[PDB]
Design a protein around this nucleic acid. Structure first.
Ligand SMILES: Nc1ncnc2c1ncn2[C@@H]1O[C@H](COP(=O)(O)OP(=O)(O)OP(=O)(O)O)[C@@H](O)[C@H]1O
Ligand SMILES: Nc1ncnc2c1ncn2[C@@H]1O[C@H](COP(=O)(O)OP(=O)(O)OP(=O)(O)O)[C@@H](O)[C@H]1O
Ligand SMILES: [Mg+2]
Ligand SMILES: [Zn+2]
Ligand SMILES: [Zn+2]
Lengths: 615, 615
RNA sequence: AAAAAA
């Protein structure tokens, strides 16, 4: 029932096409022959005209491939041959290829094309010297009665080297993508040419990807992303030695790495430098704007010699936040600048934390939250880059419930929780900015631990909203235990005091509770030894080794005055021996621990896997 | 600096090896030539005698290949050629392949071997017509001085096709496992033979596996296991279609599939049939053993016509349990039978639940727990099958905290919690039976829900022990919520009422809390519509589509009188349209939600991926 | 059985 096409080459010796045609036990249609525009193809024409009028064969000649002097003529022949294979709409069960005729290059390339595209059968035809001619014992010449005599007396062999399968993504391809130009067109004969050197690269890197996947098919689950498997021994080993923050090549590598952000405060981005001026000169009511005050930073701020406690750390960001973001224009420009910075950093997903109730003096906190989400959504729709028509960076909101040492803050906590619940129930579109969780931040001690806040978080847990808590910054492992088991937090922020309790670490690893580490905030607040030269060692390596889902974030960009790439670089700095594979593991942990739907999680996994650059 | 070995084929036309040896720039050593038996090789011998002493060329001729009449001699030549390539301790970096010489098939096989094994360079020679010969316009057959004359004025081309990479698995290999046989030996010439056509199959199915991986690479994240991506389009399409429990092929495949057990009761295995008698005839004191009475099973017990209550379900297993297992010999025999059943069922991991406090009359419950674990450990050590010296089935212990409608049961639950904590702190070896979690089992109601037990459970949360709870079988989603959030349960048992509340389902899916469903026990107790022909539909399909982590188990094997395979078949029956990919998803969910270390998780995942049978 | 099926 199959059409059973014939694909054959032709050289200076004609009559190979006709003998290849009458293969036993197979009726053929549309035999296609390839030549090199030196030899004549008349004999096959008269044979098929007199002995098989329903074959409608074609002859293809190759673009001034006169004779084999160099390499490039062979390469153009191979490319035109591959495009000629593609040009006929033929299934794998229809192609019958004979690697006979002409140069051995043509035969070997035909065998390679058959084994790559999965031809239905490959065969070689032989004839016996049964002709008198001018001198006896001659191969059968052009004339047709002698070739029929050679057939019916049994002087042909037809060795066939079995069927082939071929690549699955290269079985059909598309005969509209790779084109064949016809320099001269005439009745049942064409001379073709390929404008570009395209299919060679496609075949080469497809076979390369197959070889690399086969080479690293083992230990694939240990990889964080599937697409790392197509990286060869050299680049796999390149991703195994410890990171070198000094090298500009490593810095360029980290900068181009797609990144996932989870610990980000909207109120600590534009506090110093020109960004603060850009946010100040956008207010709707500049008359009542507070006077421009720049808080002084300690000497050597990004790498301070002496740690500073939390109160001065909060006071560093007094230039921005509640004092400045009351005006709608300032908040809108702050949101736009934050999105621009996130996209410039290469972040494919971020979760910005905001406290709209602190920005309500005449407009409601609901109005502030609506304005923030509207600014984020409009800036999302503005930047419609990336494949699939998806936003370049996807940002979700987390409401902040902040706690103070003294004063009135519980009413604020209740208001934030109710607003977060209502906002989560309001916006449910998957491809849009949403409120995905709540936070428990602020001053922490024995008397403001997580277990004092169960009763109002009962409503949030009933609603089914994600919860994250600040714990371990200024508290021992008891605070982390209260946050994990009495408040049921899904992610912990700055869990530096987790290593004291082995059982707590085992529990946090086993239930898959995420842990967020900000190297700049931890270094500036608690202080850590740099480059291996008593706060204790930075716990990133221990957390990774013990299996707990750890991630690196930025905390306050403006207060710390650096971005996520700088945080990753100094995370490598704090722990000697940290590897780029560990950075990819942190990326996978952040992707898996983030607050997003399963489909969006798969989309981000695919995007990050296919967006990893190469050394 | 490399050695630059050469591999060149020879036909009936000599003086191509001398032309292949001459290369513009490359210093060659140990030229190797492959030939049939009849054609002359003397000319290359004299050429390397008087022009290259330190070259030590070798000639190898195929034993039974002189003129090809069929494909068998081509195949034996193919195999012996691959064995000859492997027989030289050489790498790709110094391998130079020349395809000049012989049939078109030999050149094609030469290029295929070069591109598979990988070579530093593949090429071949072309000769312009230089010598006059006996008739008009010949080209050099012989006359090595004339060959040098053609060389120094340049009528030879040496078309340099290019370099190959080759598959990493077959770069080096070793000729010892794929050797050659020398039929005769004299000088540097040898006639060789290969016993079996084994390397051809190895290369063929290696390339086949590469094709399977390339075809399913895009959908790898959706696949439960990486090894499932090497199954071809036919087996993938077979797997995607819905399961048919009627077909014996499907039943055989489900039986052969490796399984993970998470819900098995040690007190409900040997209750009826010959297993009961086998347990009974092992007691240390048969005289004090109670009489033999079996409760009558309802009509059509495995598929009862009507739903049944829980009290008579408990009474149905009165032949085994506290009435029989208080004897140490009976308990040890029961553990041995349970392990043998688990191994026969194909289980590679199970967690058996026990209540040692119910088996203490003269011996402490600690003695019962120690005896049970010792029996399981000796069963493990006896059956040290499987690769890596790892036991065929790994069994962990989960203590049961029983709830009663009325009476004295809180002392028992306190005993069980303390015993579980002490047993967890006793045994800590990774590759051995351990007490890994606790249960909250027994009758429950509005006044016997989970949240009343928090004061009892905080200790087992402080010591770092996993907790699982029964809920949802005779109550609404409120018990599920209190178990998830007030007790921090990591797995829920029989959560059939979870579908009513969307918020709790989303919370359970987000937090990744495992859900264990037993189709036989649920069908018997609650009753459900079979084959789509009011308790509502069975929630397996809805749970899988919603993303919640669900598993299928056996509950009480003896009481239900069925195994894991029957449970999976009935799970398919209860949800028409259930596909085999959903079964693999269930196995992956059970693997991930099991209470075990990360290394054990990786080993279990890799062995389950490599242990899935094909259709 | 290299520039053109043994
Ligand atoms: N790294 C941190 N550790 C602890 N608390 C933090 C940290 N970063 C920010 N916070 C707290 O987060 C709360 C909310 O901050 P937000 O980002 O909304 O800025 P803000 O409105 O300018 O802050 P503030 O209330 O200090 O004026 C603030 O009370 C701040 O104390
Ligand atoms: N399907 C079920 N649902 C709820 N509880 C169950 C179920 N099956 C068993 N249990 C409870 O599990 C606890 C332990 O059962 P196990 O079979 O290990 O012991 P046993 O000696 O058979 O129990 P018992 O003395 O209650 O008959 C018992 O309290 C039983 O009530
Ligand atoms: Mg502030
Ligand atoms: Zn924070
Ligand atoms: Zn049970």
């Amino acid at each position: 029932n199959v059409q059973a096409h014939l694909f054959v080459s032709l050289g200076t010796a004609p009559a190979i096409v006709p003998e290849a045609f009458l293969l036993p036990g197979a009726r053929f249609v549309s035999v296609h022959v390839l030549t090199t525009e030196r030899p004549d193809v008349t004999l096959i024409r008269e044979f098929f005209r007199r002995h098989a009028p329903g074959v409608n064969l074609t002859i293809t000649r190759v673009a001034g491939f006169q004779d084999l002097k160099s390499e490039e003529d062979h390469f153009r022949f191979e490319e035109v041959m591959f495009r000629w294979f593609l040009a006929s709409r033929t299934g794998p069960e229809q192609r019958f290829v004979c690697l006979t005729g002409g140069f051995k290059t043509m035969s070997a390339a035909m065998q390679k094309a058959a084994t790559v595209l999965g031809a239905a059968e490959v065969f070689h035809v032989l004839a016996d010297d049964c002709c008198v001619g001018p001198q006896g014992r001659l191969m059968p010449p052009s004339t047709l009665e002698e070739i029929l005599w050679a057939r019916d007396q049994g002087h042909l062999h037809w060795i066939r080297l079995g069927p082939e399968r071929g690549w699955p993504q290269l079985r059909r391809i598309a005969p509209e993508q790779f084109p064949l130009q016809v320099v001269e067109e005439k009745g049942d004969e064409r001379r073709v040419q390929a404008e570009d050197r395209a299919f060679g690269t496609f075949l080469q890197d497809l076979l390369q990807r197959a070889s690399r996947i086969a080479g690293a098919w083992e230990m694939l689950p240990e990889l964080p992303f599937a697409d790392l498997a197509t990286w060869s021994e050299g680049e796999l080993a390149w991703l195994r030695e410890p990171l070198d923050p000094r090298a500009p090549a490593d810095q360029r590598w980290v900068a181009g790495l797609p990144k996932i952000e989870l610990h980000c405060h909207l109120g600590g981005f534009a506090t110093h430098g020109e960004l603060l001026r850009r946010v100040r000169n956008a207010a709707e009511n500049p008359g009542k704007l507070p006077p421009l005050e720049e808080p002084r930073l300690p000497e050597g701020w990004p790498l301070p010699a002496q740690p500073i406690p939390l109160a001065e750390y909060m006071k560093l960001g007094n230039a921005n936040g509640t004092a400045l973001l009351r005006d709608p224009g300032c908040l809108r420009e702050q949101c736009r600048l934050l999105y621009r910075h996130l996209v410039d950093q290469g972040v494919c997903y971020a979760e910005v934390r905001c406290s709209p109730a602190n920005y309500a003096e005449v407009r409601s906190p609901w109005d502030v939250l609506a304005d923030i989400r509207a600014a984020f959504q409009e800036c999302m729709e503005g930047a419609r880059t990336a494949p699939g028509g998806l936003p370049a960076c996807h940002v979700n909101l987390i409401l902040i419930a902040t706690r103070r040492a003294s004063g009135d803050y519980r009413a604020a906590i209740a208001r934030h929780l109710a607003l977060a619940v209502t906002a989560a129930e309001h916006w449910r579109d998957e491809n849009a900015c949403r409120v995905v969780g709540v936070d428990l931040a602020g001053y922490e001690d024995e008397k403001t631990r997580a277990h004092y806040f169960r009763e109002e978080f009962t409503a949030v847990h009933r609603c089914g909203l994600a919860v994250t808590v600040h714990a371990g910054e200024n508290d021992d492992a008891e605070g982390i235990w209260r946050a994990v088991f009495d408040l049921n937090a899904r992610r912990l922020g700055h869990a530096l005091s987790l290593g004291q309790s082995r059982e707590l670490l085992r529990s946090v690893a086993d239930r898959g509770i995420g842990v967020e580490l900000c190297p700049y905030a931890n270094l500036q607040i608690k202080g850590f030894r740099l480059d291996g030269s008593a706060p204790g060692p930075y716990p990133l390596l221990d957390y990774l080794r013990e299996g707990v889902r750890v991630t690196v974030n930025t905390d306050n960009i403006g207060i710390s005055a650096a971005s996520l790439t700088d945080n990753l670089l100094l995370a490598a700095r704090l722990c000697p021996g940290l590897t780029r594979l560990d950075l990819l593991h942190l990326q996978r942990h952040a992707l898996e621990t983030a607050f997003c739907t399963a489909t969006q999680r798969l989309t981000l996994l695919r995007r990050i896997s296919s967006g990893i650059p190469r050394p």
